[PDB]
Design a protein around this nucleic acid. Structure first.
Lengths: 146, 84
RNA sequence: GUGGAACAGUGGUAAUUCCUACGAUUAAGAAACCUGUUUACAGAAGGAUCCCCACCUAUGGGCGGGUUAUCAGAUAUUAUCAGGUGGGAAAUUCGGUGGAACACAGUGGAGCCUUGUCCUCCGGGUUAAUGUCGCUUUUGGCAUUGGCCCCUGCUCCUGAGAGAAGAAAUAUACUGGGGAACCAGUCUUUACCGACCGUUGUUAUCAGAAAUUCACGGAGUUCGGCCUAGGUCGGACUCCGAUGGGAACGGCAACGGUUGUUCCGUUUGACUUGUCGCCCGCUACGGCGUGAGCGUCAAGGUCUGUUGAGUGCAAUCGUAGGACGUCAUUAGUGGCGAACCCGAUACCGAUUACUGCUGCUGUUCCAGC
């Protein structure tokens, strides 16, 4: 028996909270309007400090004790706002439900978190993420060509 | 050059027969007993040629909707006796 | 001697209990993951019937032009889906195979020598010939020479695996232990004779005559010389000598004469790229453009080219229902299906960790007479 850990891919999506300005109805246009950008003060340690505080205030102490045994952020870059969280296979339910209840960062509010891909290895999650981003480039290129 | 030339006086010209077998969709080539091994050794040294087991031959007969005597022939005497 | 209970050792054997359903996508491979639905065709390739107009003949009909309805196995559906998922050891620092084609030492080359001797196992039995010595058709004993006879236990390429020791024993060859089946080491196996190979070093100190068939002391036998109441001397054999684990050519370690020794090289690849050569056209001093053509060579560019599991910061899942087994119940249900361990190319053999079954052996306790 080895370390059977599960990696979880999450993406930060910003909904277009603007009631005074009109909106355009299309597929890749709303992908552009939701996948805009990450703000300035976003790093690995900031997301970890926010998710530990959400783990404390939402799930408690002993739930945070079970979660924070192998709770690390393995890969994250602010240019694309996609991150990979390592966790146990038993508390993967707890980690995904903690990712769901992420309300706001302490600096920037008005954002939702999308958990997309869960697997027991990071190499297949990277392969699925490249194919998903390739599909995003296909939708962008189809709406850009016409 | 990598060859050995042929001489009509002192080289062992063999008879070689290659025939098609229809329902099993496979080419069978027949040859004398002690001549088979100089032919067989040079076959899979071509790097896209592998050898078959009789389980794999049963798989090939199962794939081509064909039949096999120790297993897929229960009607005959020996097949029924052996299999059952 | 028997039956029951318990324990121990060895041999053989099996391990997700099995089945069913479900687990987001036109962004068409997100339950954790993999594979599959590619040898393209509706005897629709001058397809069939049918509409109108014009032509020729008449008892049937055919040609020409134009729009163009119906039909292609369940009058249907082109855009769904299926299957599988860690095992007896994957473990253990074990070994071998996929390079050798039946020993064709897998093949080739070079160097050296004792130059690769169709040789010799020793040994034992029979037969023939010769010479000597005793009996006298002739036989017996000795030595030489020539000829014959004397054992692949089984499967397997390898590694290895297990069977039995009535040709001298009771314990089934020898030696040591085990509680007994037995274990380890040296060995042999239709042996109708047996066979523990040689060399070197070691067994420290004391003891003893001596730690390797050195030597020494005593007794017995046989032979030779001086010699003849048989005294002595030399050589050979046998036996013994208080000690120490010891005197037993016994124990330990290293090296092969086997068919001469040693060295060197591959027979192992597939795509991609680059160079060179071959046929076609232009041009003619080597040149240039295409074949989705072939052969050679090179390159840490790649190897999901990956396996009825195939990952490689290492997937092998969660739940519900039904079937079966065991154990405990207050009304009839509840709990459990374990443990070891997770490979990383595959296979086989051996060892080690645990559960259950099965046979044998040994022990203890209790009686039937």
């Amino acid at each position: 028996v080895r370390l059977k850990s599960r990696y979880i891919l999450f993406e930060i999506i910003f909904p277009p909270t603007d009631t005074n300005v009109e909106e355009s109805v299309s597929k890749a246009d709303i992908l552009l309007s939701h996948h805009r950008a990450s703000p300035a003060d976003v790093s690995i340690k900031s997301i970890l400090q926010e998710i530990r505080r959400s783990l404390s205030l939402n799930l408690g102490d002993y739930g945070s004790a079970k979660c924070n045994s192998l709770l690390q952020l393995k890969y994250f870059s602010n240019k694309t706002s996609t991150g990979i969280i390592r966790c146990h296979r038993e508390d993967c339910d707890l980690v995904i439900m903690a990712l769901m209840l992420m309300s706001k960062i302490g600096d920037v509010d008005g954002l939702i978190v999308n958990p997309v891909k869960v697997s027991g290895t990071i190499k297949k999650i990277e392969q699925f993420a490249m194919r998903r981003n390739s599909k995003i480039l296909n939708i962008i290129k189809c709406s850009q060509s016409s | 050059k990598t060859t050995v030339p042929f001489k009509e006086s002192d080289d062992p010209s063999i008879p070689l027969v290659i025939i098609r077998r229809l329902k099993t969709r496979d080419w069978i080539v027949v040859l004398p007993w002690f001549w088979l091994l100089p032919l067989w050794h040079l076959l899979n040294r071509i790097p896209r040629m592998y050898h078959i087991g009789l389980r794999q031959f049963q798989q090939i007969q199962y794939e081509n909707k064909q039949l096999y005597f120790p297993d897929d022939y229960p009607f005959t005497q020996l097949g029924y006796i052996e299999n059952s």
